[PDB]
Amino acid sequence: AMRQCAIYGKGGIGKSTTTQNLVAALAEMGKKVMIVGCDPKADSTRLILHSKAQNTIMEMAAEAGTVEDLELEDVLKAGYGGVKCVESGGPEPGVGCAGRGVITAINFLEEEGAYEDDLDFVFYDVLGDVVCGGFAMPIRENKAQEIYIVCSGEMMAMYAANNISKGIVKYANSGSVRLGGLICNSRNTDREDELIIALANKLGTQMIHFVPRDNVVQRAEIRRMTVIEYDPKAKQADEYRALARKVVDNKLLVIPNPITMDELEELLMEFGIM
Amino acid sequence: AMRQCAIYGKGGIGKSTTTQNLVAALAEMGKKVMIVGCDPKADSTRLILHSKAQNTIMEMAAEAGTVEDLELEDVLKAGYGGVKCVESGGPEPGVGCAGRGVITAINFLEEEGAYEDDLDFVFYDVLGDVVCGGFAMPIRENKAQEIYIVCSGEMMAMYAANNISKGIVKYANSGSVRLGGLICNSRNTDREDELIIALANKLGTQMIHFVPRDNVVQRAEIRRMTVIEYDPKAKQADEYRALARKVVDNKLLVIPNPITMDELEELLMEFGIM
Ligand SMILES: Nc1ncnc2c1ncn2[C@@H]1O[C@H](COP(=O)(O)OP(=O)(O)O)[C@@H](O)[C@H]1O
Ligand SMILES: Nc1ncnc2c1ncn2[C@@H]1O[C@H](COP(=O)(O)OP(=O)(O)O)[C@@H](O)[C@H]1O
Numbered sequence: 001a002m003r004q005c006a007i008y009g010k011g012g013i014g015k016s017t018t019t020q021n022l023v024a025a026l027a028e029m030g031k032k033v034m035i036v037g038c039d040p041k042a043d044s045t046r047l048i049l050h051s052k053a054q055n056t057i058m059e060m061a062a063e064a065g066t067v068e069d070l071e072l073e074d075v076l077k078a079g080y081g082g083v084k085c086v087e088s089g090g091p092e093p094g095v096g097c098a099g100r101g102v103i104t105a106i107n108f109l110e111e112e113g114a115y116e117d118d119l120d121f122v123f124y125d126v127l128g129d130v131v132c133g134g135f136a137m138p139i140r141e142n143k144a145q146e147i148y149i150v151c152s153g154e155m156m157a158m159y160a161a162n163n164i165s166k167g168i169v170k171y172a173n174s175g176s177v178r179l180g181g182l183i184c185n186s187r188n189t190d191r192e193d194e195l196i197i198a199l200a201n202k203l204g205t206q207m208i209h210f211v212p213r214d215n216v217v218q219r220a221e222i223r224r225m226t227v228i229e230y231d232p233k234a235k236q237a238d239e240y241r242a243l244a245r246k247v248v249d250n251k252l253l254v255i256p257n258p259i260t261m262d263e264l265e266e267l268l269m270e271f272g273i274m
Numbered sequence: 275a276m277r278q279c280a281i282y283g284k285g286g287i288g289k290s291t292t293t294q295n296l297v298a299a300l301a302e303m304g305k306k307v308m309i310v311g312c313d314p315k316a317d318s319t320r321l322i323l324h325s326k327a328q329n330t331i332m333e334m335a336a337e338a339g340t341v342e343d344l345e346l347e348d349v350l351k352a353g354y355g356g357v358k359c360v361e362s363g364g365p366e367p368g369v370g371c372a373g374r375g376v377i378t379a380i381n382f383l384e385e386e387g388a389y390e391d392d393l394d395f396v397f398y399d400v401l402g403d404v405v406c407g408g409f410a411m412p413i414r415e416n417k418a419q420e421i422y423i424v425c426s427g428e429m430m431a432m433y434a435a436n437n438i439s440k441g442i443v444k445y446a447n448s449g450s451v452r453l454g455g456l457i458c459n460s461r462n463t464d465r466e467d468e469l470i471i472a473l474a475n476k477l478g479t480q481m482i483h484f485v486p487r488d489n490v491v492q493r494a495e496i497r498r499m500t501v502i503e504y505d506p507k508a509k510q511a512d513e514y515r516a517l518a519r520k521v522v523d524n525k526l527l528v529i530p531n532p533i534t535m536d537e538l539e540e541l542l543m544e545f546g547i548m
């Protein structure tokens with residue numbers, strides 16, 4: 001068995017930092033993981049690979065001629081803890097659909113046997129500001145059974161979580177894609193944990209972890225490293241270990257209950273965030 | 275003559291708050307303005323209309339049968355200072371292309387004569403996290419000659435500004451779409467103004483205004499109002515008046531010079547933001 005998970009959320013919310021640190025913690029535990037980058041920013045694997053970023057399947061297929069001329073062993077790269085890494089890529093801005101590389105990449109990985117029985121987890125790191133094209137494909141085509149949404153007390157981040165949840169509902173008649181939890185990536189605001197707990201309850205899920213804002217993240221990332229590798233004794237490393245443990249142990253996977261803008265605004269007003 | 279302007283930027287950066295306040299300041303000056311909402315969030319006109327939001331062209335065409343059964347005078351709504359307002363709308367998450375409503379809306383406005391000679395400005399408020407589909411249409415189809423990008427010292431906001439600039443470059447062989455400036459919507463961080471000035475210089479544009487972070491915005495918006503209308507004496511009202519004046523007087527419209535991720539990271543490192 002292997003658990004296919006996707007991390008969604010609005011841009012800049014902390015998807016890639018949270019995913020790579022969570023996965024490093026899983027590898028530290030003994031799990032075999034692969035990360036599939038599904039964001040055109042294409043820096044979703046750099047902290048595992050100690051790298052600037054990673055060359056993308058779209059880039060690599062173009063140099064090889066066709067995606068058929070690519071070999072999986074040339075594409076997947078292993079970094080910290082043996083974690084395997086790949087980036088989808090996408091067309092340049094203003095050219096075609098920003099999500100088109102995700103479809104090509106996931107199909108390539110499936111055909112070439114990347115989903116080896118020894119893997120324990122796959123994590124897709126997916127742009128979540130729009131839920132369409134290749135960005136919706138992990139949900140529409142039943143690729144990620146467990147969706148975790150990174151958000152914060154920011155209205156836009158909660159709105160994005162609600163929109164992703166609407167996408168999950170739309171495809172619930174087929175497949176088994178479910179909402180597994182919200183991850184609050186703290187803005188260091190008061191009552192933010194309570195706000196995200198309340199949002200999760202309205203959606204029917206849970207706040208699986210509250211990730212604190214901590215400067216050690218920036219110091220690790222300047223050195224192209226997860227906190228797990230950079231400073232295994234840091235408080236923040238233990239936070240990512242707690243998130244990883246709760247993901248491993250999580251059994252709540254629901255069809256969520258999207259809320260109205262009225263309910264979103266009411267949540268914001270109640271917890272004094274405004 | 276009328277100047278067609280578009281406000282782009284990543285989600286949550288301040289596009290709609292900045293646009294509606296800028297436009298209220300223009301109306302206060304005596305300008306005739308229309309705002310075209312091009313973001314699926316569809317709350318780009320609520321502060322002009324004193325409203326929850328505005329029903330969208332996609333919603334309204336569906337109830338009327340066809341977009342041909344819609345009348346412009348039923349669609350455009352006027353609020354503070356006579357500013358005219360319309361929302362494109364878009365499909366639900368997971369359904370088709372998130373930007374498809376923008377194409378329908380702009381074509382409807384053009385055919386129905388919305389671009390009356392008496393208008394001084396049109397502002398499109400456009401989602402900027404992906405530059406594709408209907409979100410690229412104002413650039414691809416030469417609808418907004420002057421692009422202003424709202425950003426901040428946040429790496430993701432600067433990355434988005436760079437991506438939008440790449441879209442402008444891609445279509446520079448036709449039409450007259452140009453980058454008019456960056457608007458820094460402050461995160462209250464040190465050297466943020468200098469950082470955005472430096473980014474603008476590398477792109478070949480300017481920082482047209484630094485908008486401070488000010489709680490009066492939240493107090494105005496709780497009451498569904500621009501700061502201009504809510505408290506015309508507020509310091510922040512004068513900030514939006516300064517932005518509006520500089521937009522009116524701006525003559526620098528360039529084909530920008532997009533930068534590398536290496537240059538973006540170097541900017542961040544230099545100004546001590548990290
Ligand atoms: N818990 C945290 N503490 C401190 N900084 C963080 C934290 N989470 C994310 N960041 C910083 O926020 C920025 C954006 O995070 P990232 O994961 O790249 O977002 P996304 O992938 O959602 O666009 C990065 O500079 C990252 O280092
Ligand atoms: N200069 C500012 N000072 C205080 N709050 C602001 C400012 N600009 C924006 N905001 C707040 O930031 C949030 C997001 O702004 P908004 O314009 O809706 O972003 P976007 O349209 O880019 O998604 C809103 O709650 C808004 O009130």
Ligand SMILES: [Mg+2]
Nearest residue numbers: 015016039041
């Ligand atoms: Mg990322």
Ligand SMILES: [Mg+2]
Nearest residue numbers: 289290313315
């Ligand atoms: Mg907006």
